[PDB]
Amino acid sequence: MGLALGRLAKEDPSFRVWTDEESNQTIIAGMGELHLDIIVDRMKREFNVEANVGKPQVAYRETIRQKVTDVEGKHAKQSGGRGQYGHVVIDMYPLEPGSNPKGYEFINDIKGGVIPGEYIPAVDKGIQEQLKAGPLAGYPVVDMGIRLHFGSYHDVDSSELAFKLAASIAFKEGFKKAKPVLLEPIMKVEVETPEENTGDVIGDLSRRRGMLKGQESEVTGVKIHAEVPLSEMFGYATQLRSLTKGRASYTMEFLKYDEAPSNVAQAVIEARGK
RNA sequence: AGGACCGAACCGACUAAUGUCGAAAAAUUAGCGGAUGACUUGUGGCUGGGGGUGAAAGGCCAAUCAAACCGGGAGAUAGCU
RNA sequence: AGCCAGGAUGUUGGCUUAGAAGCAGCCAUCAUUUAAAGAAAGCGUAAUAGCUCACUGGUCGAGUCGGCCUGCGCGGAAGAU
RNA sequence: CACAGGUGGUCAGGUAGAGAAUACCAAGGCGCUUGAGAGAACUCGGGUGAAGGAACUAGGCAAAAUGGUGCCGUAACUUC
RNA sequence: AAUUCCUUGUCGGGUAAGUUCCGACCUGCACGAAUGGCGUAAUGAUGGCCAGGCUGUCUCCACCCGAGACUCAGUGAAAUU
RNA sequence: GCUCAACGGAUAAAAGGUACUCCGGGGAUAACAGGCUGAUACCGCCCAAGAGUUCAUAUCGACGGCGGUGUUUGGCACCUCGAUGUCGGCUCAUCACAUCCUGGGGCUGAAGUAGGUCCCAAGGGUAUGGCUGUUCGCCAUUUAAAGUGGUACGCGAGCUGGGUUUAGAACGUCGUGAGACAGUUCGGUCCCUAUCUGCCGUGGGCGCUGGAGAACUGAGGGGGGCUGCUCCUAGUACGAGAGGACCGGAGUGGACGCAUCACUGGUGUUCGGGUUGUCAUGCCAAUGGCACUGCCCGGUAGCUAAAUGCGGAAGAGAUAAGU
RNA sequence: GGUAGCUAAUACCGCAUAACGUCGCAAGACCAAAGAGGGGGACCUUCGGGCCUCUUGCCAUCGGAUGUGCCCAGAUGGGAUUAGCUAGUAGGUGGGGUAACGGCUCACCUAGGCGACGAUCCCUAGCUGGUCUGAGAGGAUGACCAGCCACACUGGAACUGAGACACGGUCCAGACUCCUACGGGAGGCAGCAGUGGGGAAUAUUGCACAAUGGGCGCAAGCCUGAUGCAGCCAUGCCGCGUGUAUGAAGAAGGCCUUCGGGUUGUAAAGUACUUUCAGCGGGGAGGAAGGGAGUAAAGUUAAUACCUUUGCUCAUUGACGUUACCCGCAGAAGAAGCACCGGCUAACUCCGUGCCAGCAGCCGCGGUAAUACGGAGGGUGCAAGCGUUAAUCGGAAUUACUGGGCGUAAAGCGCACGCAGGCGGUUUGUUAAGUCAGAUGUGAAAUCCCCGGGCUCAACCUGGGAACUGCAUCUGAUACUGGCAAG
RNA sequence: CGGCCCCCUGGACGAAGACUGACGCUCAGGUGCGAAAGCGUGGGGAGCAAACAGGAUUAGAUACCCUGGUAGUCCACGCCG
RNA sequence: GGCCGCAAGGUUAAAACUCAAAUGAAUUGACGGGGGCCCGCACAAGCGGUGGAGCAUGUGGUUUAAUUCGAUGCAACGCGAAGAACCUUACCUGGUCUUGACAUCCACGGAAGUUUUCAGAGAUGAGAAUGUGCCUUCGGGAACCGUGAGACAGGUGCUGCAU
RNA sequence: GUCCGGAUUGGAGUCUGCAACUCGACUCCAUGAAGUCGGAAUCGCUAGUAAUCGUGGAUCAGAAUGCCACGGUGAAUACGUUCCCGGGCCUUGUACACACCGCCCGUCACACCAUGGGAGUGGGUUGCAAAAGAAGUAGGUAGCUUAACCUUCGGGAGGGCGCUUACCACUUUGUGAUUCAUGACUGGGGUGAAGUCGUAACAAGGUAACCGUAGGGGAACCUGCGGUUGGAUCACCUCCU
RNA sequence: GCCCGGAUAGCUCAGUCGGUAGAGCAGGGGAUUGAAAAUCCCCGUGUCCUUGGUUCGAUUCCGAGUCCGGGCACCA
Secondary structure: OHHHHHHHHHHOOOOEEEEOOOOOOEEEEOOOHHHHHHHHHHHOOOOOOOOOOOOOOOOOOEEEOOOEEEEEEEEEEOOOOOOEEEEEEEEEEEOOOOOOOOOEEEEEOOOOOOOOOOOHHHHHHHHHHHHOOOOOOOOOEOOEEEEEEEEEOOOOOEOHHHHHHHHHHHHHHHHHHOOEEEEEEEEEEEEEEEOOOHHHHHHHHHHOOOEEEEEOOOOOEEEEEEEEEHHHOOOHHHHHHHHOOOOOEEEEEEEEEEEOOHHHHHHHHHHHHO
């Protein structure tokens, strides 16, 4: 597949191939679906590479919708030679979406040296490792603040990674109590169409959950703007070409990480769990 | 040499067809299995019914067996037809 | 009842102010030219319009419109020699 | 029952054959106590089979097949 | 599994396709150590399964050859009603 | 002086199994089958929340409403216990229509192709295999499609007997035990000559008004009716493009039926030849007999299908839904 | 392709005829051949010729040289978790066959043969001179060149020929391309280039027969992808070069800095100078011996002809090749890298990142002051090269013959007996196998080494010796080992 | 290898003489012996004691410790090596 | 895999892979539920206490705007602190100023100082009055208060595992 | 629960100090708690000591139940080194060396790597037993055809094509041997900064270890029988001539 | 289906015909005696299956309910 797609990208620059870093899927992109159809045909004939054609996996994220306080995590494993003691108490709270470029906030509010300052980075690191694989469906956790304010150590049995284990326990229990939700991307879509073909474009966009922001009547006709989920923005090239008799051109860009509609989010949560 | 091997006589009786008011109240035609052996067989006796005999099925004891057959109790009984 | 006419400016009114425009929708849901227009019945609009009707004029020029109580019928009603 | 059944021992030939098998005959004895026509279906004891070769079926049941002496050759496992 | 109900369990081998067959996993409804457990060369008119030879078993049946059926003359039943 | 507690108390004293079974009875009473009924099952319809971007009614249709059929699991015990052979398969069917295909249309969220849904329609047609006892089901490959059901869950005086259903046995389990188990495993008698309805055929008598030999008319009745692909129409109508036709025409095939033997083959124990064992013809030579025609190699006429001709129409009339 | 006629020859076939040829005890028997060219006196011309003379070929025989075939011995990988193997197999006689011998092949008889110093089977593999290594002994390995062997799309066979069981020949079957009129054909780069592929990776679809070598020819000659040269590639070795000389404020700028200075460092500019080599333009050996016309002489002959043999002169024979080589000119101009700098190991510090990013051959460095991780100055090695990786030997006396071990570090079988195998007291004699000595034969040349020479030197090329450590023979020597005999 | 006794029997050693005359050393393969525990058959079984049971102990103690206790230890013949 | 064995198993006998060591003797220590010996309120023999009570004080913990910070087996916990009402004070809220409260240097202006008033929680702000001394080159300088300049000053900020 | 105890709370004060609200000391009047000798455990002290009684100081404006000093009164016991704690010397064992708070073993859980077995599956190479017979030779030849040699000169001799036989290539079938690959599952081995359950070895490692065998058991191991030292300890006390 | 029975600390029961519960183990302040352990001296952890009523004045009685399990559901 890699070899075949490389040859096709070399002869046709308008054809792009990348691996999506999140899904690990090979994504192919082209100047229309009939274009991609010919590319796929050549790949599975000239090179004869057996492949399935699907849709770019929507980048699902994870977050909470409820502050939880006083979440205890106590890794107390005093067994097997010497013990490993670690004890942390954290508050977990949602951030506003995109309010932090890091998607994560850590507040150290330890008072009284209940935790030695040397173990605080190991607690933060234990949380940050758990943010990579969320407790709901195993997607990355975003838009969340954690305040470490209470904890305890043992002079002989306390370890850096023991406090990291305690942090993970506290996080997993807190996250389940915090009403966890599955997130979604939304794509800003712009469609240029003749004025007489305008109507059809939006009829289909409405079925594709496209929140029409507005329109900019241009010389060709109308420049309609809509917020459409990535999931519903697939196969649009040929669909538009059908509604507009082949005189329409759209563009799309990633807008923001909004909340997936309860129905959509829950359906995927169940499917992932299965 | 062998409860040895292949196969007739003799002894058995797996399979299919027939015949099933039959040729015959269990056999015939076509293969089968055993065949010096815990082999088969003629003639003469011994065990008698709640008992015999049984490489053991309630199988056999005169086409009669979870208790024969044949006289007598006895014109058993029968709230059943 | 038809056959010829018209069937508005405020008002793209706003709430979401994206505009939600007389026609997805709580809200004026009036005063006027008036015969009037509900400040829109109804299709048509991504979102207006569009084409029409409520209302009114002329016409030909008679009865006519809508429920209730009862008779009798019509449909609903397709099965195996 | 003038019944395609059962009944112990002796004698036991020629040619082919390992042979009392089996095949044709010898000595001897018999045609089986109902016959004559036609030459449909169908039932029975048998023969041949185009191309395909278990696709039939409960299931290779039945049928076809293999089939003799000499010599060459002979696997896993095995209590050798 | 001659033992497993569920259950055609699940995975692999075999076939175009395999509730049976073969080898395993172990969640043994409800295996088990002389009411013996587990293997085991050889043997078996023993159950299951596959490949081959070869064939009218079959797809789909045709023609031939003898004994009955049909007819001619003689003898002449039976179950049942 | 009795929990004689089965309380009108059969004894002072009493528990099972039978598929090894037996007798006497019963449709007084079950299983299989029919009948009445129709909860359930199946198909249809009523109200229309809401879904369907918008919009109840293109397509689904909640919560609730009303009926039809006699199709499954049942209720009843009406027929049969002096016997109704009781599942599945084979062979053979035949009606019903609530229709899987081919035919005719209406709406579409019907561009075209292809489909979604409902109405009219019973003329014909409606696979072959692995596994299983399987109806069923899953799978593989086809197909114009592999319809849903009455018919004693059609059909055993037609067939098989694998399953359930006798006696042998064995495993697990339940019992002290005999023995039990819609729990399992291996084995395991299917009987009849057709009297009378019925039915496929073929004849005798009389009759039909004098007798006889021919030819037809034709009241009435059966058989028959299916369809694919390819080309042309045209890569046209339609459509962004991809794709892609109705209406009409030609040809060429599969399943099924009809007739025939000219062609390609089968058979062809009555025709020719080869040959093994043996006997006879007096012997040699040559022939004849018997061994499944002895075993085989060919094959004329007939009979045959795998072979080869032909079919199923058009047209017309009156109509269904609809226009 | 087919048919029917015609024509030549050093093509083909009988005879004559032989020997020191073949066979056979002999006697006998029997065998073969081919002719062409130049010139000419008389002769003679059927007017070609005959005839003489010269040059070469043929046939037969005995030799020599070259080449080829066959045989014996010894050496020539790994494996015993391969121990038995074989029936033309071992041999004999007889027949056949081959250039010959031979189980090369048949017929019969005998029952052999091989094998623990390794038969049989399996795996691997072209062998050698040699090459790389090593102080040697050894270990690795067969690039290059040269000798031998094997193969020529795969399998098998033969023909022709002195010689193939045949790279650019034939026939058959197989697979794979190509043409076709569908009937049948055609083809084989492991020759030179070239292409696609495969791969980490290996070159131009060049020119010329000028010499050497080959083939044919009496010669001239033509062919020769042998060869002689050239293109492309640092792949390697060797050589030369990007100047040399002066010149301190010890400049600027760079970094270090106790910030005093140090360093880059005579390094630069400048100035004084030269022109190796690419540049430009000219001169310009040698690789060439020959051969040919002419000439003249000597042979040769009947003949000065012709031909043989020796000199003279003339015109000439170079793909390389705008040759090297030499001479002149203009301009500092056209010409320097790469690795490393913790330790082993030559060469040190500053800055950022902090068990993160990583580095590394080994030990190890990195957790907030990193000579080790990246930049900068500086240094060091090497140099048109420099690093890594792979690969062999060395170091490794870690397979120990030279040249090691086994009381406890790895290692004495549990112990014994014993066949084969290995080793053996002492005295004398003999032989002379081992061993030692001398000589001959060979041990190809190249390559290594030595002393020399020739390309400006070097690499490269060459002369002689040395070596080839070996085996075989002959003559010896006889201590020692062995064999034999008496002790 | 251990009471004592008998019978059969190996090997070593010492002294003074005699004899044979190197008849020698070592040993791959080969053959023989080879504690204890196991295994086979048939006996024997006091003691002792794997397994096993009970009591304690212990956090648990399927161990030490306690009480029992089968194989086994014993003999004849083999095997194992 | 072969051979042997009734079996247990024996005998013969590898390779992938992985590590940079594994091992031997001896040495100094350390440690021994090893031996000898020996010492101390270590024990034995005694007296009086803590742990229960209430209070003082320190710490842990939790609370809080902060509850400053360090000590935290013996060898921290009436410890740094031989003394926290403000001060101390490093902590907290709020109000403030920046070459600065503390030093050296520069340029200017004013003796320095003193008294007193308002505004302000205070820091400060605005003043209002008065004083006007010392050495003289008096164009002075510097004891001293302010304003501007850049050097710098400040840090109870971190690291006792740099010292 | 007292004329014991004096914690607590109300009012009344005095002083220090700018200042006593959090947050000072002391006086007065009133109020009068828990507590009736202290669980498990554990601390001090060998003579002017333990115990009790009171004074002064330093810090400081004020602010001791603490610290630092001072005198008063003034005990009990110590046979003794067996035992714990710590230490010193000598000898011994050791697998310990940021040194017994040391080392370190094997189940079990997860990921990974390479292998053994595995119903089998697909290749390679090859043995055997046979079948097969192109082309080419070699042997035979009923048949057709034929220049040069010969001929009684008719035709012979001899050859060629053709037929056939022997050898043998492709090719086929059957059955073995060996090797490469793969196979659900499965046995063990290795590796993996900080897993779970014990703690088997190293000291007499707390039952001396280890070897062979046998049995058992979640592990390490434990028990029997034999063997070895690659095992320490042999000193004190009672007694005796 | 039929029948029976139960549900009590996190777990399991003790216990009950009577409104208001015991133990360990998981959990313990303090023990243990470098440290912890072990967990030792001693302590707790429930609403005793729940309600609704009846009333030894309900988990209990009685029914309901909620759930699970057990034995039992065949014969033609």
